Ligand binder design. Structure first.
Ligand code: K
Ligand code: K
Lengths: 221, 221, 221, 221
């Protein structure tokens, strides 16, 4: 768990965890090109590595005869990892998001020089998820909305391009998160306004917290 | 005052104090369904408990013969509690708001794990009260306003639904409090603009103070 | 300089200094009702008190024979105080603003319980002065502007009421200072936009500084 | 390197470095009056001074026979300084921006009384560069945009004045940087919106960092 190979491959599993975290909601809510397997099987490769690797107990160091820790990993958590590593409504691919638990246990690797990028990227991930939810709402809530008005802000009532309908949603989520509100996008229906209240509260929370933290990092530097 | 029964029932009296604080202004300014008695009488139950409970003096511990502290509670404060616990213009139900004093004396119970939720909920309560005031103003100031323009933002000039006319007011109060100002709602008349100056000042005060406090809590964690 | 009479009268001279500071620019830029003399002569009363009062030197305590300190006050600063206390273009009444120097020397009186109100009131004074400047600009810059558009936001192209044309300017200055920008007021001409850049910079400076200070006060409490 | 002449002339080279940093992008992206030479040759004057001046080694003090440090300056960095000091597409004048490196090595001169102005001026420089980029985008992205709409906000579809088309861009960059968003300017096309996301992130970063720093300076004072 501390070899150069283990270290670099763990950095790589974080990289591909970021990859899946940013590419599963996108194609899960926007698209209803063969790079899937190289990571869907890399995760079970990681599972087997977790089987064969070395580990430290509550006070026991790394031990030989590597069979004692497999049932221990299964007793700690393996079912969630397994259902993560499993390929009409095939929406269950969203369970792949459980790969986030992967970066919950190994934070001793990354916990100043990297935390800044990590905070900016988690802000970006939060923005991505909220833009995904906003697009889901603006597409589901049909019998006037915001997509109707985007259809006139850009002269494409048919249907605007998907790059446009995603970049605008990301723009709006950054607007509401960073408390600017340019006004070209404006929640107008009732579910929109309730989501806007929710996102304003979540902004006042997270935009304040992570940026107090980044100011603390700057001061520590 | 320190039994498990006393503790849980005090948490419950805080819960129902939040209940009344959030449900009296609402139906007091928006509505001019039998859950009233179960708390209006629970408050006088609490009064009798305050009579029969045990208490500590300036330096004296809890004493037997529980009759010495009743007149002492009456000398400290009982008239406000009594007029709180009392059922043309029956607007006097707003005096029920005095139940807030109930959570003024027992803050040693709640003063980190709960203070975060308490701060978010007091921000929500402030938002609720200011949205109530805004609705009162937008309904009273008649001979052009903001409700007139909401009648066109949502295609309902008659009268919009009460859920709509409340969710928009809460949306606007969160907007002005968190300094975003999406622009779909816009104070346009003179009393509106004076209220907007007042709320901008109260925002610059409270939005700054409570969030400095929440950043301090996060740092302490 | 330390009697109860001196103390209360100094608090009163601060009160009337606030009075003149908030009522000279207003009627100096908006109005081109006999309460003027009671303070214009109270200032020279204060001058005579400064003559007759007691004072402490660099190391010398209060001395008898009160004639040694008059020429000393005249050597320190008396000409500015005199030209302050003096009644076609009589715009020179703006020199009365020099009464602010009066509260520059006596800050040891007020320097926590009062500093909060003092900071809120100096924010209000800054808002007042900037709204005065904004009204001066919107009235002078004539050959499309913002007053033209206010004439349609409120159905009064003639001329809107002075209370309206002042409350809107104060609203806009609070907007730009507290970084909300509701959008009902919008700088559109070139001098307007240059003033807006200036006020945005002055906001980013002062709104940040005074509110860091008020957070520090809250933390000290 | 520590004479009064050296000190004042170094302050002057910082002044003219600010001059070139603020006047090269402007005329490099807006203008496609003989004050150029007096500084373009002053920079190579500075080069010769760096040749002839005195310097301190890792531990060696200033030494006589001033020929040992010339090749050392050439080994440290001279090619970038030389290509800085060198006069169809003559866009290579943007390489003059490398004069910023000049104020990278001599920060021990300026590192409280001056840092405030320096921070305000670097915020102004960032605003200038971003307004330059915004103008470049709004002029290049042709086959609806923001300049089209400015052509109606100010009644000049032809072409608006260059002072107007620059003061508006600086206004918008201050808006997006200080998180106000008055709404008179509104990104509407796709490249505009992507730039807006980028600038909102860069705002949330720098507007927070430099103003935490200015609050720290105020507290230190
Ligand atoms: K804002
Ligand atoms: K805004």
């Amino acid at each position: 768990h501390y070899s150069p190979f283990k270290a670099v491959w763990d950095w790589l599993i974080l990289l591909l965890v970021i990859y899946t975290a940013v590419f599963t909601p996108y194609s899960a809510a926007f698209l209803l090109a063969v790079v899937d397997l190289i990571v869907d099987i890399m995760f079970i490769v990681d599972i087997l590595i977790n089987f064969r690797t070395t580990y430290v107990n509550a006070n026991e160091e790394v031990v030989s005869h590597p069979g004692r820790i497999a049932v221990h990993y299964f007793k700690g958590w393996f079912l969630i990892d397994m259902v993560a590593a499993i390929p009409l409504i095939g929406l269950l691919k969203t369970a792949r998001l459980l790969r986030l638990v992967r970066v919950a246990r190994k934070l001793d690797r990354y916990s100043g020089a990297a935390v800044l990028f990590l905070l900016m990227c988690t802000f970006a991930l939060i923005a991505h998820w909220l833009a995904c939810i906003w697009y889901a709402i603006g597409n589901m809530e049909q019998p006037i909305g915001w997509l109707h008005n985007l259809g006139d802000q850009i002269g494409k009532p048919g249907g605007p391009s998907i790059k446009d309908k995603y970049v605008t949603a990301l723009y709006f989520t950054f607007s509401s998160l960073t408390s600017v509100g340019f006004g070209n996008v404006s929640p107008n229906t009732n579910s929109e306004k309730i989501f806007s209240i929710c996102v304003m509260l979540i902004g006042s929370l997270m935009y304040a917290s992570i940026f107090g933290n980044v100011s603390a990092i700057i001061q520590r530097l």
